[PDB]
Symmetry: D2
Subunit: 250 residues, 4 copies
């Protein structure tokens, strides 16, 4: 049984195409489904409001491109691009993209990273969250405010202020445990190790869970959780942290 996964990714993004396949490859050790990966790109090189807004404009084209392949699920990878567009935009985006696929004769469940993160946090039953991002400070503020608007408290948060998206990919994930250690996490229900999909975090997730004893999620992890759930499949993925423990089928 083969599942075709479609990914709408920023052109300069390399991490979504690394971590989502890594996770699902691990899942193949544990469950019979096999996965193939199919991408469409929307141009962005620098994570600024202007580039984000322009990139999102290519959204429809990308969904047309991937529904031409009759992909079984489609994930819009960039969390901040969705949240940058204003409150509740993750719903707008998902519904519009679904319509685009439906009118291309291949209705597909649509996941956005932004929506997946919110849904994953709710599935965990987490009420308060700590958040690490790689974004410039204003963008990070928007994200935190978006999460708060969705009824999820935000405690400590950190912004690495790296706008060059290729430089974001170059950030050492082994720095992340020390960053999280220097944040308050005792008053938090879950830790968002990366709100961004470009910043690698997968290889630090289990370490951080061990160190903090809190559930750790990332935009990438939440997205795969949401894709799996949208396909009515078990969500147990080795190395994917608490959300992918197998205990959560929300």
């Amino acid at each position: 049984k083969v599942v075709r996964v479609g990914q709408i990714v920023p052109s300069s993004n390399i991490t979504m195409e690394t971590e989502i396949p890594a996770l699902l490859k691990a899942r193949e050790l544990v469950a019979p489904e096999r996965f193939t990966f199919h991408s469409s790109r929307m141009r962005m090189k620098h994570v600024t409001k202007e580039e984000l807004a322009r990139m999102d404009g290519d959204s429809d084209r990308c969904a047309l491109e991937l529904s031409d392949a009759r992909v079984d699920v489609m994930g819009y990878a960039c969390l901040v691009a969705i949240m940058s567009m204003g409150h509740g935009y993750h719903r707008v985006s998902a519904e519009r993209l679904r319509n685009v696929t439906e009118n291309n004769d291949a209705a597909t469940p649509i996941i956005t990273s932004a929506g997946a993160l919110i849904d994953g946090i709710r599935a965990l039953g987490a009420k308060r969250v700590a958040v690490v991002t790689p974004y410039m400070k204003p963008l990070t503020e928007l994200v935190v405010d978006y999460i708060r608007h969705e009824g999820i408290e935000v405690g400590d948060y950190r912004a690495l202020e790296i706008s060059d998206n290729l430089a974001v990919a170059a950030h050492d994930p082994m720095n992340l445990p020390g960053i999280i250690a220097s944040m308050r996490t005792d008053d938090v229900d879950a830790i968002v190790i990366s709100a961004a999909v470009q910043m690698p975090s997968l290889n630090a997730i289990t370490m951080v869970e061990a160190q903090t004893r809190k559930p750790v999620i990332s935009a990438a992890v939440a997205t795969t959780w949401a894709m799996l759930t949208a396909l009515d499949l078990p969500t147990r993925v080795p190395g994917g942290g608490t959300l992918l423990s197998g205990a959560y089928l929300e």
Copy 2:
């Protein structure tokens, strides 16, 4: 980690299937690991006009993929290249490379058309039998292109499936039977699939056993050519003669 870029028709699913499968197999025999990154050019129906329009979008795709500083790029659609005119695989690869260089990330560009020709030559094969999924006029162009490159063509078959997604649904286990119904004794190598879109991977060894001749597909040729472009050994289990390790 090696970053592989894939420029694919929107309806193409088999390049993103067989190339990862091959490279995953390679990870078992060699230390390199691969990640895969795609950009799409829209096309549902494989006609002369649509192929030309889609190729016009090639450049955007190379731009998008070089934003991610990919280590190689493979252009999936064989017939698109061969449809544009004689020798076009060279012109395309050059123009696409220039795009990546102007985007501050010059990268080697492989077309499945060029890869098949180079693969055939690497095999030392002078004469070839070919299976395609294309409509008859288009496979006439493909055969003529191959012949223009100094490679003789014996028996060839066209499945005449213009619906590109439908091409990927063709059962690879049909391919040995198709080949068995063709003359292959006057041939040095068998092109089991001239199209990356038509799956053939699981049929390659069977056909090699049945015919006792080296068998290649556009998909294994592309894999071979991308590996060679990165100066990497080309031993891949289950990839047939071209990926023997021998070359």
Copy 3:
């Protein structure tokens, strides 16, 4: 880089040869080392004191068999067989087996499941532990007393009382979360989901960690941790629970 793993297993044991390769297969997704697996068998069909004592007598033969292959590490799989022989026997067994390999011209690091479990608990810094076993009650008592003797408190423990070793293999690991739920685990530092190496538990480990928010280990997990550490290799294994999070190189 290939690592030859040797396993001394009860003849009727199937789970050690399932979970240790499963774990190390997952590790191959994350680290460059590749593993091959080589077993020697010591006969046992029923987990009784008499069968355990007889089985342990074949110990030297098994170590000779595996050192003929110049295995890079050697694990004695059966936890209860070691503990059944009296306090401190895990040290005796490891040193004797090492000597056997050394005199067979292939000195090998030796791990026992029993010793690995104790070392893994200490590596976690866990002081008090809850324990599930499949053994008959007297044998379970010995194990708990062995752990206590090693300076590790035992709170709640459960014994499934299944002595047919093939029946132990047939125990549904999805029963384990409910068993652990009906034990007190708030006053415990870590949960031993299986003290036995025959009872499957790997596929329930991450679920139980999510449900309890405590580190979960098994004899199988502790053994692979100990084998990896003995080979000076990182201990990050996807799906292997807290001990294999990558945070513990004791």
Copy 4:
């Protein structure tokens, strides 16, 4: 889940390497998953006497593995079986099966000796070239055994390595060169390794490409024969002609 039992000489490491590798490759093309379980019979030096003593321990191994209710058993050592006398692969398999039945767990028993002969026959090969790692007198016995089974032997080579663990250290990439120095034109198939202990897996496709003849090893034969004993399809990528899917 399919439970595979392996009866191996203590110093044998390659059966537990190539059989898992092959079956892992199969998991990519077929739904079955495999676990591996071994029992050992002591032996360091491959001599007539030691082979006989080690074979005397076969029964214990079958007993130990049937305690775990394994779905098949493969006896690794080809020369041990062929050394005991003509037709011994049948006697051994039968005696070992009876052991498992008396242990309330009757299981199909494959010997690498029987598997190679059955594999050669399944290929339709009448005449064969053979490479062995054994000392000359022992490979004389092996060749004579094969000839007694109705399979002609052309060119054969003996590497004369009596240290069994050392056999596994022989570079498989030496094998194409060894074969290239042998006559293979008067042969229907090539036994690239008559010993499971001598690795050959990574050389199979290369030799098939170089010689244009089906290539089998005792290790792929054993894998083929165990799969057939469980009525499972025998398509395994990278396993050469016998594991083509064709048979």
